[PDB]
């Protein structure tokens, strides 16, 4: 096989992980105790097989406090996971990157790596790692950047992909999240081959506007995210021709290592109360991918230039209808590619429709699409963060919490200058 190990760090990473694994099981026909009735496999990339016929996720869940993981330990999927792969400390990083990276984080890092090694040692051909975490939390930001550093040493040739939760004020828990976001991005940039940022604001708005949820909660946000993450990983878990391994994600979506932040767009997002909605054609859902309101990150692709664009269809989609829809997009729309990239779209079709979790907010649909594109408009996301960082950092607000936890003040400037170079990297591509 070509196995993938998922690592879920901090509350966000863990809660989103719980939602994904729930979906993966429903998609592959695996029960919550790991058993799967006699079916035939490509799901082995994500699940190991025990001798007793049990299918165990190739996953690690780590947090510095036990609350969130304890829910996992006692929940519906309590028997699914390897119990030794749910690791917890006693005391968290208090929304402080320095605590997760330098002080508290160092008390559990060797244990986490020895547990990752136990999973790695059960693999025939380990492709690499999928890492889920928040930018804003102390564990999500600090422990992840510690972990990614250690993984680069121990698994140098392996690929590392991230799913990152970018902060939104409506659901932010800390004033210092801009700081944590920048400090983790600076230290993880060289260790990550491809990073899918999920903007909590984007998902919050899709929930309010498309799903009619007055005040979305993490339960709502995470079920919509898990649906988008499943569409991104489906290629790794099923037979297919586009993005069939982790290396192919970088080839197809990352022309230059530093600008490794693809934008994901997903359609249709229809409310479960609209069961009898008229089914949307390929043309309609492909068009919907170029509307800013369906994006996982708030930004305007019409203000940027495209470097790569992948369309991942699931369901009742005839390839000829895709070609005709792309044809209209190239002629009609003002979608500008950079001059040095073949002005083209890579297309993958998986012919089973998406699955919806019972308890979810989404309607069953006959066809859906996830578009992954590397556009320079995503630099608006960094600019917004960099501005908040700059406002607090000019007056050194909250810096003492960080230097008091084993960090040099100089690290704020090195990280900020790396972010200035990242913003320029996008300027130099897209003008």
């Amino acid at each position: 096989m070509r196995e993938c190990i998922s690592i879920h760090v901090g509350q966000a990473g863990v809660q989103i992980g719980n939602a994904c694994w729930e979906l993966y099981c429903l998609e592959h026909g695996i029960q919550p105790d790991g058993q799967m009735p006699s079916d035939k496999d490509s799901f082995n990339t994500f699940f190991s097989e025990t001798g007793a016929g049990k299918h165990v996720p190739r996953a690690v869940f780590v947090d510095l406090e036990p609350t969130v993981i304890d829910e996992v330990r006692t929940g519906t999927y309590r028997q699914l996971f390897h119990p030794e792969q749910l690791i917890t400390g006693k005391e968290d990083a208090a929304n402080n990157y320095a605590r997760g990276h330098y002080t508290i984080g160092k008390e559990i890092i060797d244990l986490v790596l020895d547990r990752i090694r136990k999973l790695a040692d059960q693999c025939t051909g380990l492709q690499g790692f999928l890492v889920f975490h928040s930018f804003g939390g102390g564990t999500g930001s600090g422990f992840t950047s510690l972990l990614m550093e250690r993984l680069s040493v121990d698994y140098g040739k392996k690929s590392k992909l991230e799913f990152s939760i970018y902060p939104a004020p409506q659901v932010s828990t800390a004033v210092v999240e801009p700081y944590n976001s920048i400090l983790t991005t600076h230290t993880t940039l060289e260790h990550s081959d491809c990073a899918f940022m999920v903007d909590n604001e984007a998902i919050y708005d899709i929930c309010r506007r498309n799903l009619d949820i007055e005040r979305p909660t993490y339960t709502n946000l995470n079920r919509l995210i898990s649906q988008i993450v499943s569409s991104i990983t489906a290629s790794l878990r099923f037979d297919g021709a586009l993005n069939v391994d982790l290396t192919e994600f970088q080839t197809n979506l990352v022309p230059y290592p530093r600008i490794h932040f693809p934008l994901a767009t997903y359609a249709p997002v229809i409310s479960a109360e609209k069961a009898y909605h008229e089914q949307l054609s390929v043309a309609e859902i492909t068009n919907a991918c170029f509307e800013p309101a369906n994006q996982m990150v708030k930004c305007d692709p019409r203000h940027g230039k495209y470097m790569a664009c992948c369309l991942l269809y699931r369901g009742d989609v005839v390839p000829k209808d895709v070609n005709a829809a792309i044809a209209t997009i190239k002629t009609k729309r003002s979608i500008q590619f950079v001059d040095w990239c073949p002005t083209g779209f890579k297309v993958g079709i998986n012919y089973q429709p998406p699955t919806v979790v019972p308890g979810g907010d989404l309607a069953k649909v006959q066809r859906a699409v996830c578009m992954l594109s590397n556009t320079t408009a995503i630099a608006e996301a960094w600019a917004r963060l960099d501005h908040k960082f700059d406002l607090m950092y000019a007056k050194r607000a909250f810096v003492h919490w960080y230097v008091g936890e084993g960090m040099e003040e100089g690290e704020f400037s090195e990280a900020r200058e790396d972010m200035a170079a990242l913003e320029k990297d996008y300027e130099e591509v897209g003008v």
Binding site: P169, L391, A394, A397
Partner: protein
């Protein structure tokens, strides 16, 4: 982090401390014999934070009662919850402090301090993951001020990686016209700026003015003043005592509330304001609660918030109410009153909702604010300290206990420096 160790020093400290236990015990469903009598699962989930679990299903406060005056032992044991405290946790002296900070800090209190650390050490070593310490005391007397600041300093040296939090009640000639109080308070503030992470300023000036002008009580008693304190203390600790994700522990509260090490004196507020057994507050809505919260008349420190700027704010809504409506009103107050929030700390207001309201109310709001307007409190004490200090009145009472006169000029100088820092950040622009 889970456990908090609570300490109460001096007459004021014990009086308000005793009320704290009576109020939170009613909210958690604990009877005066320590048995649980509640009808909700949320009441026990975070009970370990303030109570130790004993032999039977009997909860015991994690409290240490201290005084140089034995008379207060008796007063506390005579209360309803007087028998709930562990007898081994009453550490009392023979002769009082005589309202002399030097007796508390250097002579009588220094003889007893070691005895107190033994009880603190016992409680701290029984904790699964000690979060920190909580002290209630007055700044105007001798035991709470002098001995309390000594205790803080000896605890910080033994437990430097734990949070030290105080509920410090400031003097006012309206309640006690003992003229040495500005000396005791000024000498205490000097200790507090250096050795606590978080201090709640409970100003007797403001407690008296609320009772007198708003609650129309012609002769406020300490019982009337303490009714406001107990309601405030229940409010500010809600997030620590019930399941939640914003400011759920002392450290996360501190990283969100304290942008600069010395500026850690919070101005708490509460709405609706009520007197003992009146039940007048009934028709109170979310917009009214939100507007009352930020009114000068509702502040427990005699400071006008509209004379300064908010660095950070944590608001706590308690009761059954619309999260959407709370999001809307809170945003409205920030837009309407933009000029009273510093622009260089983005998203500096944080909102928590707890489903359980306080005793005798359906709806409640608690405001914890770090405002530069708190300098009006310190300037008031500074002026009274200077009036007295210039004529050297009663300085012999302090120097007779081996206290150097330069400890007075150093305290004065530090307090003046603190006032200047608040003004520095009040005038600071983003630019």
């Amino acid at each position: 982090m889970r456990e908090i160790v609570h300490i109460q020093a001096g007459q004021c400290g014990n009086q308000i401390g005793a009320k704290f236990w009576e109020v939170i015990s009613d909210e958690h469903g604990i009877d005066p014999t320590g048995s649980y009598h509640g009808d909700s699962d949320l009441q026990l989930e975070r009970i370990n934070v303030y109570y130790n679990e004993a032999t039977g299903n009997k909860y015991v406060p994690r409290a240490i009662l201290v005084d140089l005056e034995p008379g207060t032992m008796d007063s506390v044991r005579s209360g309803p919850f007087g028998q709930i405290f562990r007898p081994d946790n009453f550490v009392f002296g023979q002769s009082g402090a005589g309202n002399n900070w030097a007796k508390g800090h250097y002579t009588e209190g220094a003889e007893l301090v070691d005895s107190v650390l033994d009880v603190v050490r016992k409680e701290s070593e029984s904790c699964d993951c000690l979060q920190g310490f909580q002290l209630t005391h007055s700044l105007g007397g001798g035991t709470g001020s002098g001995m309390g600041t000594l205790l803080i300093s000896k605890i910080r040296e033994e437990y430097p990686d734990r949070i030290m939090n105080t509920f410090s009640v400031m003097p006012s000639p309206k309640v006690s016209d003992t003229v040495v109080e500005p000396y005791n308070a000024t000498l205490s503030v000097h200790q507090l700026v250096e050795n606590t992470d978080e201090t709640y300023c409970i100003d007797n000036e403001a407690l008296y003015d609320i009772c007198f002008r708003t609650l129309k009580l012609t002769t406020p008693t300490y019982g009337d003043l303490n009714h406001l304190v107990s309601a405030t203390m229940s409010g500010v600790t809600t997030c620590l005592r019930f399941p939640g994700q914003l400011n759920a522990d002392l450290r996360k509260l501190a990283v969100n509330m304290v942008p600069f090490p010395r500026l850690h004196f919070f101005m708490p507020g509460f709405a609706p304001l009520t007197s003992r057994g009146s039940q007048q507050y009934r028709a109170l809505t979310v917009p009214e609660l939100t507007q009352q919260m930020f009114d000068s008349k509702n502040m427990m420190a005699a400071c006008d918030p509209r004379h300064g700027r908010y660095l950070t704010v944590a608001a706590i809504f308690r009761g059954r109410m619309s999260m959407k409506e709370v999001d809307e009103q809170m945003l409205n107050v920030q837009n309407k009153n933009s000029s009273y929030f510093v622009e260089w700390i983005p998203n500096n207001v944080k909102t928590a909702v707890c489903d359980i309201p306080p005793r005798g109310l359906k709806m409640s709001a608690t405001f914890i604010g770090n405002s530069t307007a708190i300098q009006e409190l310190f300037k008031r004490i500074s002026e009274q300290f200077t009036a007295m200090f210039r004529r050297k009145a009663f300085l012999h009472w302090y120097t007779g206990e081996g206290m150097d006169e330069m400890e007075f000029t150093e305290a004065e100088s530090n307090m003046n420096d603190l006032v200047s820092e608040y003004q520095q950040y009040q005038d600071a622009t983003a630019d």
